[PDB]
Design a protein around this ligand. Structure first.
Ligand SMILES: O=C(CSC(=O)[C@H](Cc1ccccc1)CC(F)(F)F)c1ccccc1
Ligand code: NI
Ligand code: NI
Length: 183
């Protein structure tokens, strides 16, 4: 299983690279790592297993974060009230369209790869459409709003060498953009 030992940390060069598109089908090895990434999320969200193996809690992970510079991500966002949950392993995900309307988490964002907490609002598109491939090379189109959309954008940024804190206003970190919605 993956652990925090596997997660590379801010300053590591792989995080600042652009990750390579995968050829399809995936190798037995690539499928294995994408399942393991999902398994990390699951494990990190279990109280017991996370205490035991020293796991930070996560809802998303991009392959660059385990030092594999390939365009695959995993997102595990549990039910949390509404009956909606997000359990997705995506290959070559792409944002094909979005809202003009920005949104933001009012406490900022975190990142498994960033050891410190950073304060600052990270403005993002409130709605997105994503086209990607699943683990078996079938076609996936996702329409996301709000928290799920922020999460996927965060992980997609990882595939382009962008970190959440790059989007934070150095002067006015906690100033929302006008008409940006709080999530
Ligand atoms: O905040 C988190 C997890 S933090 C997280 O998923 C990171 C990214 C993140 C995205 C959007 C908002 C905050 C953090 C993942 C990373 F580091 F792997 F990319 C949480 C976990 C379980 C229950 C409730 C909340
Ligand atoms: Ni992150
Ligand atoms: Ni700004």
């Amino acid at each position: 299983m993956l652990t925090m030992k596997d997660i590379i940390r801010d300053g590591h060069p792989t995080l600042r690279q652009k990750a390579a598109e995968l050829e399809l089908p995936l190798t037995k090895e690539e499928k294995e790592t994408l399942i393991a990434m999902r398994e990390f999320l699951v494990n990190s969200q279990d109280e017991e297993i996370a205490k035991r193996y020293g796991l930070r809690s996560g809802v998303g992970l991009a392959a660059p974060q385990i030092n594999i510079s390939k365009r695959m991500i995993a997102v595990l966002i549990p039910d949390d009230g509404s009956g909606k949950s997000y359990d997705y392993m995506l290959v070559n995900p792409k944002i094909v369209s979005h809202s003009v309307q920005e949104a933001y988490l009012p406490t900022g964002e975190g990142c498994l790869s960033v050891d410190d907490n950073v304060a600052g609002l990270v403005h993002r598109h409130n709605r997105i459409t994503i086209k990607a491939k699943d683990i078996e090379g079938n076609d996936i189109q996702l329409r996301l709003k709000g928290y799920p959309a922020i999460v996927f954008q965060h992980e997609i940024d990882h595939l382009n060498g962008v970190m959440f804190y790059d989007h934070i206003d150095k002067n006015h970190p906690l100033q929302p953009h006008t008409d940006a919605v709080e999530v």
